[PDB]
Amino acid sequence: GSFCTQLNRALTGIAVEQDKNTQEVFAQVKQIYKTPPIKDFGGFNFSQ
Amino acid sequence: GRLQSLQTYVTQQLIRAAEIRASANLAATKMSECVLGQSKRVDFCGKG
């Protein structure tokens, strides 16, 4: 019967949840901010 | 077959109950921090 359509649904839920997890963790910014062309940060070095 | 179906349903319900338990814990924490008081942790009680 529906045992493995249930299993496919469960795997589909896991994949969708993983996509949501990554989006929630990283997409916290409405706009993509861009670093200034000059690295004049008062002596702090962010090249790394 | 029927017992395997019932056990799969019970296990899936237990996993969903764990997810709802986590969501309810988050809701209780939000009620305590945002509603019962003022929260200084940003984005815990909405953007801004």
Ligand SMILES: *[C@@H]1O[C@H](CO)[C@@H](O)[C@H](O)[C@H]1NC(C)=O
């Ligand atoms: C930061 O360090 C790197 C390598 O140590 C260097 O090339 C770079 O010039 C430093 N940053 C600035 C602003 O000098």
